[PDB]
Ligand binder design. Structure first.
Ligand SMILES: Nc1ncnc2c1ncn2[C@@H]1O[C@@H]2COP(=O)(O)O[C@H]2[C@H]1O
Lengths: 150, 627
């Protein structure tokens, strides 16, 4: 059993990634009210805890951080604000967990659109790192593979 | 052969049955069927012939008695108000809709040319042989464009379609019969609740008018008068369900109210002529903390960088653009203002001009600011946003755990009942897309955070350790009483407040707590286990009876993931499977409020909480209480 957590600001594609990993948009209908909604098997079972839609509820991310074991720090490349927001979340994990080091991954979602892009690759290099895309299936599985390794 | 197929079912010989079956193997409409079903059809398929082009096979609005397969020739599919919608040719079949749904014919079938031959299966034989196997997926076409997809998942349900065709289908299949009075109020409910996503009132109201006045083009005078009357009765049912759904919210829609006032006059005038609508006209006459309306006005303070402010008078549903204009009015401006939300912790968000009803989307201690873009980074919070500096233990410690929980649940119920089912829809699909307020939902969702931070605030403002252990004991008790009243929302809010980093840190406080309450809390903390899609909570809430307040953040999550997980449009048609899913989740709230719920000093405290929502402040307070 493993528990992975998807963190980030709104409009970043957290939910799009989660569904695209566990099941897939369009190909099948997505029911988020059943036991296996966020569970997938890869040989180990993954439970994705996503803060999508609950961002205003600070207690919800904390509960997810406490139960988590791997963390996906997702941002968008169409929004300057979202990479700036990642500093706080990084530290907030290292306070609920009460540990010194936590296995995590940085994710730069929405790479498929370059004509609207305002952020660069440069910024996320130093703090793994992917320029994934949920809607274009780029690096979707990669995100959740790395966390199980770590 | 034709004489053979004209013979009644119980008159055909074994050799007749064998020769027919061979021919059924050449019909593509029957190719998907099993050998068992096909030989049952050999003794059931009647041959029918008509010579004259323009002969009407059946009328729209008639009860369906037969399913047809075209051998020779072609037919027109005619729908009232549209005329010839499409043509069916050699090898095509029709008429299964009325038989499966037990509903009137959705269209008229008229001969296109001379000398047409049909294979027919009557009602009793269709239900026995074909009902479970024939036409499980039906995609209707109009002008060579796909217009509706029905699937047998027992009647057909709408999988996808155009807004117009979906409405047409839901009208046609309204059950008028008095014994079936709630079995229709549940089928229509999906459409009535969800239409605003794919067919707003600007389209729906004209469509309803056109449907109400649509006359039949087929049948004798009596037949036509009957078809039109039932059509009119069905439209009225829809309008009643639509008006009931919106309730007081119609005041925000001038088009919807103008329609309802004109519709009522039309029904009244028709009732004076036809002596009908006796049951439905008086019901239509009735329609023609309190919930906040979008048309209500607020006196809202918008602050400048120097911390002076302007009080603006605008509607609750006003856009950021209207807010900017109101500030620019009072201050006198042509200097490019932006509106920005700010937290107690200095965190800032620039609001788009597009954003509507932003006043209630603020954090507990958030304020609204107006400034040019270059002032953005220099903005600093108001002292008022930082919350209280002394506790209120002296006040609420003198109050009963049971009384606090009761007054909390009473107040939570007032707030929960103020929320409209449609506000959940607007919130999910995005406020700006509807220009409607979600103010009632926004304030009720905010209360979760208010209760959470109340706990953290009071614990962190309690300097005496012995009293702090008494606080933890009290909050645990208040949480337990909230769970008894089936107020699961406030229950989880208190437990999460206890789980806060600032509170959980206090080892000397937690250690000195009786093992009874340490046991209690451990059970509460396991109820919020996220494992297997919050299985622990979901089962707890499933056991409970109707009058209950659900864990709201999880409801919002379900709603978010239904929307992002599923597409609204498939193949350019409305994905009604998705619409149905959203509707079920919203009706979940209707189920929770279906039953009613069973000390002015205690009422006052609970409804006027003062809270620190600045996490950094609360941590600093905690770190000086127990280093
Ligand atoms: N676009 C369409 N709308 C309605 N009915 C159609 C359409 N195309 C074909 N039909 C067939 O016409 C039949 C008219 O009677 P039923 O409602 O029993 O079943 C209907 C369908 O089988």
């Amino acid at each position: 059993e493993y528990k992975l957590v998807v963190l980030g600001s709104g409009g970043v594609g957290k939910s799009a990634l989660t569904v695209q990993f566990v099941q897939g948009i369009f190909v099948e209908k997505y029911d988020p009210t059943i036991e296996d909604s966020y569970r997938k098997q890869v040989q180990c079972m993954l439970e994705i805890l996503d803060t999508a839609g609950t961002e205003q509820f600070t207690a919800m991310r904390d509960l997810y951080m406490k139960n988590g074991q791997g963390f996906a720090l997702v941002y968008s490349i169409t929004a300057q604000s979202t990479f700036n927001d990642l500093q706080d979340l990084r530290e907030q994990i290292l306070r609920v967990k009460d540990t010194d080091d936590v296995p995590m991954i940085l994710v730069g979602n929405k790479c498929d659109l370059e004509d609207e892009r305002v952020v660069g690759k440069e910024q996320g290099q130093n703090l793994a790192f992917l320029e994934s895309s949920a809607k274009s299936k780029i690096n979707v599985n990669e995100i959740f593979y790395d966390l199980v390794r770590q | 052969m034709r004489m053979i197929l004209r013979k009644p079912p119980g008159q055909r010989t074994v050799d007749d049955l064998e020769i027919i079956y061979d021919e059924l193997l050449h019909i593509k409409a029957l190719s998907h069927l099993s050998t068992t079903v096909k030989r049952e059809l050999a003794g059931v398929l009647i041959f029918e012939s008509h010579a004259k082009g323009g002969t009407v096979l059946f009328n729209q609005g008639e009860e369906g008695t037969s399913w047809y397969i075209i051998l020779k020739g072609s037919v027109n599919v005619v729908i009232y108000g549209k005329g010839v919608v499409c043509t069916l040719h050699e090898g095509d079949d029709f008429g299964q809709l009325a038989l499966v749904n037990d509903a009137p014919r959705a269209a008229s079938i008229v001969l296109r040319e001379d000398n047409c031959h049909f294979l027919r299966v009557d009602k009793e034989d269709f239900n026995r042989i074909l009902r479970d196997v024939e036409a499980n997926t039906v995609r209707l076409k109009e002008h060579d464009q796909d217009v509706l997809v029905l699937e047998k998942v027992q009647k057909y349900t709408v999988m996808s379609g155009t807004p117009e065709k979906i409405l047409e289908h839901f009208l046609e299949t309204i059950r008028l019969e008095p014994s079936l009075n709630e079995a229709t109020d549940s089928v229509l409910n999906d459409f009535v609740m969800m239409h605003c996503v794919f067919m707003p009132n600007t389209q729906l109201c004209p469509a309803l008018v056109a449907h109400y006045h649509a006359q039949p083009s087929q049948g004798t005078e009596q037949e036509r008068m009957d078809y039109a009357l039932n059509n009119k009765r069905r439209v009225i049912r829809l309008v009643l369900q639509w008006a009931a759904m919106y309730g007081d919210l119609l005041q925000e829609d001038d088009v919807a109210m103008a329609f309802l006032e004109e519709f009522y006059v039309s029904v009244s005038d028709d009732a004076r002529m036809m002596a009908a609508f006796k049951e439905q006209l008086p019901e239509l006459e009735k329609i023609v903390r309190q919930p906040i309306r979008g048309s209500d006005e607020v006196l809202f303070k918008v602050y400048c960088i120097d911390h002076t402010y302007t009080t603006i008078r605008v509607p609750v549903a006003a856009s950021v653009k209207e807010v900017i204009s109101a500030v620019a009015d009072k201050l006198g401006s042509g200097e490019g203002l932006i509106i920005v939300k700010m937290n107690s912790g200095g965190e800032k968000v620039v609001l788009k001009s597009n954003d509507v009803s932003v006043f209630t989307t603020l954090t507990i201690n958030g304020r609204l600011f107006a400034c040019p873009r270059e002032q953005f980074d220099s903005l600093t919070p108001l002292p008022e946003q930082e919350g209280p500096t002394t506790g209120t233990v002296g006040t609420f410690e003198l109050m009963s755990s049971k009384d606090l929980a009761y007054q909390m649940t009473t107040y939570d119920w007032e707030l929960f009942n103020c929320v409209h089912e449609l506000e959940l829809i607007y919130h999910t699909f995005g406020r700006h897309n509807f220009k409607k307020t979600t103010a009632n939902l926004d304030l009720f969702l905010r209360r979760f955070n208010e209760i959470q931070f109340w706990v953290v605030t009071e614990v962190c403002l309690c300097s005496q350790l012995s009293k702090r252990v008494q606080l933890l004991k009290k909050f645990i008790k208040i949480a337990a009483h909230c769970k008894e009243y089936k107020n699961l929302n406030s229950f989880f809010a208190i437990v999460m407040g206890l789980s806060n980093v600032a509170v959980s840190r206090l080892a000397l406080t937690w250690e000195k707590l009786p093992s009874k309450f340490k046991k209690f809390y451990a059970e509460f903390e396991s109820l919020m286990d996220p494992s297997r899609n919050h299985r622990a909570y979901r089962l707890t809430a499933a056991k409970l009876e109707p009058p209950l307040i659900p864990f709201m953040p999880l409801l919002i999550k379900d709603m978010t993931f239904t929307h992002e997980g599923n597409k609204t449009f498939i193949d350019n048609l409305v994905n009604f499977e998705k619409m149905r899913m959203i509707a079920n989740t919203a009706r979940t709230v209707r189920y929770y409020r279906s039953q009613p719920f069973n000390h002015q000093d205690v009422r006052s405290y609970v409804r006027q909480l003062n809270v620190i929502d600045n996490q950094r402040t609360l941590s600093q307070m905690s770190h000086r209480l127990e280093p």
